[PDB]
Amino acid sequence: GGGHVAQIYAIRQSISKALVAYYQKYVDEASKKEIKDILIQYDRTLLVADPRRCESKKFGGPGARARYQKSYR
Amino acid sequence: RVQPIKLARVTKVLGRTGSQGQCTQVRVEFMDDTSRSIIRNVKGPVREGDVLTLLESEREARRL
Amino acid sequence: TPDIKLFGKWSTDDVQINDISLQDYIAVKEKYAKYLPHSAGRYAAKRFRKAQCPIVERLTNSMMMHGRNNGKKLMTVRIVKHAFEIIHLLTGENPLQVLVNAIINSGPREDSTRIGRAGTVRRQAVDVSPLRRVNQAIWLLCTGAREAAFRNIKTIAECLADELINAAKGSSNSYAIKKKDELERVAKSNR
Amino acid sequence: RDKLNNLVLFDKATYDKLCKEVPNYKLITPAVVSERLKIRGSLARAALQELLSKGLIKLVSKHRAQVIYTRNTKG
Amino acid sequence: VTVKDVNQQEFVRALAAFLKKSGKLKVPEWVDTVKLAKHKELAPYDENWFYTRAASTARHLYLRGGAGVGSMTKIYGGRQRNGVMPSHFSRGSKSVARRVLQALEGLKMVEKDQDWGRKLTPQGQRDLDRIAGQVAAAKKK
Amino acid sequence: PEKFQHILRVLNTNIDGRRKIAFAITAIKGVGRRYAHVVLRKADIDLTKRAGELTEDEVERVITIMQNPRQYKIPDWFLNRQKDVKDGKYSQVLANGLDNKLREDLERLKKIRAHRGLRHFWGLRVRGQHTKTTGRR
RNA sequence: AACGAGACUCUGGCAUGCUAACUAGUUACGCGACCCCCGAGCGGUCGGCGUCCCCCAACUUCUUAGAGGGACAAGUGGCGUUCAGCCACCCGAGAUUGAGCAAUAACAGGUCUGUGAUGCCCUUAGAUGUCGGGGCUGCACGCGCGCUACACUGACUGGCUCAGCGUGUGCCUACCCUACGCCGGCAGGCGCGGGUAACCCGUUGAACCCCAUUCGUGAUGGGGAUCGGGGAUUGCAAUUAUUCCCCAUGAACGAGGAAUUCCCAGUAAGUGCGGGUCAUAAGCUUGCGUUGAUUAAGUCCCUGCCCUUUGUACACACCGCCCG
Incomplete structure (x- = not known):
């Protein structure tokens, strides 16, 4: 899914979340917290999914906020 | 008659003028000496604590 | 990567915004070092937030201009990474420091606004905010590099390096430096 | 203006100019060679790859789009 | 290295050359004349290119269950400049890819797969893996 | 060199x-x-x-x-003149000779008085295009 | 108190929670095999990416669609009648994801060519009710929406390479989507075989893009106009090119005056795709994902419309009504 950059961001998030999910069931909590700390600090969203998503285009423009063209008379 | 350059730090953001609404009123703590405090008009986006570089250092505006 | 969070490979630490006030909408990383001039980046919602954005990325974004070039960040990131390398070859240093310097040096301190003035509308000398100083500078340099690069053999990365270097120590060779002095000169009259 | 006309084949003496100059420059790309001589751009290129021989010039990035070369490896 | 181990450009570059040395692939006499895609602007600068496509395809098949020419035409197919009209896909030739598929068979790299589509053979699977190693081995760099 | x-x-x-x-x-x-x-x-x-x-x-x-x-x-498909007609050629016309054959072809269908010919003669258009709004200058 | 707004409904993100799934997948076997040696080992054997086996394996995490919960600006801190609210900050999806629903009352707004809605009128055998053929498509000139462009952030050749909204035949009367083999440079031709579809086309292996080369700043390789010849597809019929291709001919355009549209976040812009039209025919419209900024964060200056107060010889209402 997504496309070329889209994919990169997803895989990196999956990996860091992965590592933390793993320290949460097998290792100890302080370690995983240490990791969420380093990520969350410097970050990039690594452990939290960015919301931002397509807005729907509305008749009268070919984009969502873009409105066609007018000449008046 | 004159030249110098003055550093001044934003104390309190007053509100907005220009009929277009694009100049922001400001109150400035005079940086090199705090015992000064004056009102200056701004082009850009300004927020408390950041710094102006005053040419004129008297003047002290109002509307326009 | 684990020792210190360098840039493509450049250190954030030890770069100092040599200019009080500007300090701080130029965002290096009073902790924020990253790796790449690309991010999901939500800057738009708030008025200020943009300041948070790393200046490098801010510069990279301004790079992708002109209808055709819109949205080509990968291209800009590529250009930016190259430019830093050219700058480094040209003076050692941190090219990022070089970048910051050009930005500090270019923001018009004073400017002019078109005050109504009755008739023969005169223009009022006003001082310029630091956000504007940063915003304006990055334009100037980008417009400078882009304008130069267009009919010449030389690449944007190169023209960018040239604009950045000349500006870092304000050579006035630069388009941007000449523009800033022009805007400021205008500010002073009017008053 | 800017009308550019380029020497598109080697002229001996221009071969000498190349190896006896280019060690002068810190930056060399296609454009440099073109402006500072009057090289084709096509024959700029071939001069770059050749120069990288065992180099007069040294690679720091030849991004598909761009070579970026430095002065040779002096003091 | 699995072929998956080696970067696509070097893998294809090395294999394509290996094929060239082997000297026995086979080649619609044309190949001098052909564009390779109606979309195409000019033919291929490397008139030598028949080998590169073959390598590319062999690698392409090894990756996947089975593929056929239509897919390749599209893969090779780029965007075609309508001129006045906006640009659109145009799956690239079918003779070249077919001939490529037929020729590869001769070497046994690939064989007709069940339910249509050509699949890599174990002979090819072995051959690609072998060159893949050679490429990995060459050097670091 | x-x-x-x-x-x-x-x-x-x-x-x-x-x-x-x-x-x-x-x-x-x-x-x-x-x-x-x-x-x-x-x-x-x-x-x-x-x-x-x-x-x-x-x-x-x-x-x-x-x-x-x-x-x-x-x-042959690569060629400018397939199927001649007058000789049932194929051909690829070259050089000064292209201007020549262009003239011929136009003459041919002007002799025959076919509408295309006529169009070429008045210096309008021969493919089906609207002539109301364009090619005006 | 009610009406519009809102609440309301719809769509889409946060749910290792819920109940589930062979017309959806995943794990993980049993996994052998294909089986390669890719590395190690002399090899048996070990670790290894996929395909295939399918199973009396297991699952619901991705996928799915149903029910569940979450946002109330909740806590805290400044500000304000210390109120209503405003701003910052935390958890975290953050107060504002984006639409749909629209009153009172109007208009000589548009529509008789949507209407077997319709009046009157007109016509009605020498029809103003159908077939053959053309116009609608006639070109000194102006206008509007658009498309494509003006190149080295590019044009090119090889090569990395991922998707999503949607769609189909077995049809109100003639007919589908099409993978795969072969022939052809192409365009396309030809032989098959599945699919009322979450099964198949289609892990939509898209395109931008990314990249290793070439070009080199020349209207040149930017651009693709116009024209000539020619190949094929749709149709009984394409000439007035339906369209597509192949070659050739290779234009203006090297940044756009007066003016002027639209726009605040997946937004502008680039970029492909699918649906509608449809026998054939997209430069269109109409969504969809992909790549993704610059920039106000406000205000009433211009413009437009409604809020008071006020003036009015206006009231078919300034596109209105005053002197010689």
Whole structure:
């Protein structure tokens, strides 16, 4: 899914979340917290999914906020 | 008659003028000496604590 | 990567915004070092937030201009990474420091606004905010590099390096430096 | 203006100019060679790859789009 | 290295050359004349290119269950400049890819797969893996 | 490396030598880019160079292929004049000779008085296009 | 108190929670095999990416669609009648994801060519109710929406390479989507075989893009106009090109005056795709994902419309009504 950059961001998030999910069931909590700390600090969203998503285009423009063209008379 | 350059730090953001609404009123703590405090008009986006570089250092505006 | 969070490979630490006030909408990383001039980046919602954005990325974004070039960040990131390398070859240093310097040096301190003035509308000398100083500078340099690069053999990365270097120590060779002095000169009259 | 006309084949003496100059420059790309001589751009290129021989010039990035070369490896 | 181990450009570059040395692939006499895609602007600068496509395809098949020419035409197919009209896909030739598929068979790299589509053979699977190693081995760099 | 020519002539056109062969050739009427590109490939030249470079040899070799393309693994579909009609040719018209045949063809259907002919004669259009709003200047 | 707004409904993100799934997948076997040696080992054997086996394996995490919960600006801190609210900050999806629903009352707004809605009128056998053929498509000139462009952030050739909204035949009367083999440079031709579809086309292996080369700043390789010849597809019929291709001919355009549209976040812009029209025919419209900024964060200056107060010889209402 997504496309070329889209994919990169997803895989990196999956990996860091992965590592933390793993320290949460097998290792100890302080370690995983240490990791969420380093990520969350410097970050990039690594452990939290960015919301931002397509807005729907509305008749009268070919984009969502873009409105066609007018000449008046 | 004159030249110098003055550093001044934003104390309190007053509100907005220009009929277009694009100049922001400001109150400035005079940086090199705090015992000064004056009102200056701004082009850009300004927020408390950041710094102006005053040419004129008297003047002290109002509307326009 | 684990020792210190360098840039493509450049250190954030030890770069100092040599200019009080500007300090701080130029965002290096009073902790924020990253790796790449690309991010999901939500800057738009708030008025200020943009300041948070790393200046490098801010510069990279301004790079992708002109209808055709819109949205080509990968291209800009590529250009930016190259430019830093050219700058480094040209003076050692941190090219990022070089970048910051050009930005500090270019923001018009004073400017002019078109005050109504009755008739023969005169223009009022006003001082310029630091956000504007940063915003304006990055334009100037980008417009400078882009304008130069267009009919010449030389690449944007190169023209960018040239604009950045000349500006870092304000050579006035630069388009941007000449523009800033022009805007400021205008500010002073009017008053 | 800017009308550019380029020497598109080697002229001996221009071969000498190349190896006896280019060690002068810190930056060399296609454009440099073109402006500072009057090289084709096509024959700029071939001069770059050749120069990288065992180099007069040294690679720091030849991004598909761009070579970026430095002065040779002096003091 | 699995072929998956080696970067696509070097893998294809090395294999394509290996094929060239082997000297026995086979080649619609044309190949001098052909564009390779109606979309195409000019033919291929490397008139030598028949080998590169073959390598590319062999690698392409090894990756996947089975593929056929239509897919390749599209893969090779780029965007075609309508001129006045906006640009659109145009799956690239079918003779070249077919001939490529037929020729590869001769070497046994690939064989007709069940339910249509050509699949890599174990002979090819072995051959690609072998060159893949050679490429990995060459050097670091 | 070496030098020479700038400025060489093939069959009745002057061909800038500085220029790359493929592109250099395309001055000749009837040699478009797809043409000249395939002709040269046929004609054995190091593709890598400038028309001004190369030999008198290679030149005749380009010309010979250019006016007998069929006889060199150039397919007919690559050709300007398939199906002649007057001779049921195939052909690839070249040089001054393209202007010529263009004239012929226009004359042919002007003699015959066909509407296209008429259109060409008044200096309008012959493909089905609207003539109300454009081609006005 | 009610009406519009809102609440309301719809769509889409946060749910290792819920109940589930062979017309959806995943794990993980049993996994052998194909089986490669890719590395190690002399090899048996070990670790290894996929395909295939399918199973009396297991699952619901991705996928799915149903029910569940979450946002109330909740806590805290400044500000304000210390109120209503405003701003910052935390958890975290953050107060504002984006639409749909629209009153009172109007208009000589548009529509008789949507209407077997319709009046009157007109016509009605020498029809103003159908077939053959053309116009609608006639070109000194102006206008509007658009498309494509003006190149080295590019044009090119090889090569990395991922998707999503949607769609189909077995049809109100003639007919589908099409993978795969072969022939052809192409365009396309030809032989098959599945699919009322979450099964198949289609892990939509898209395109931008990324990249190793070439070009080199020349209207040139930017651009693709116009025209000539020619190949094929749709149709009984394409000539007035339906369209597509192949070659050739290779235009203006090297940044756009007066003016002027639209726009605040997946937004502008680039970029492909699918649906509608449809026998054939997209430069269109109409969504969809992909790549993704610059920039106000406000205000009433211009413009437009409604809020008071005020003036009015206006009231078919300034596009209105005053002197010689």
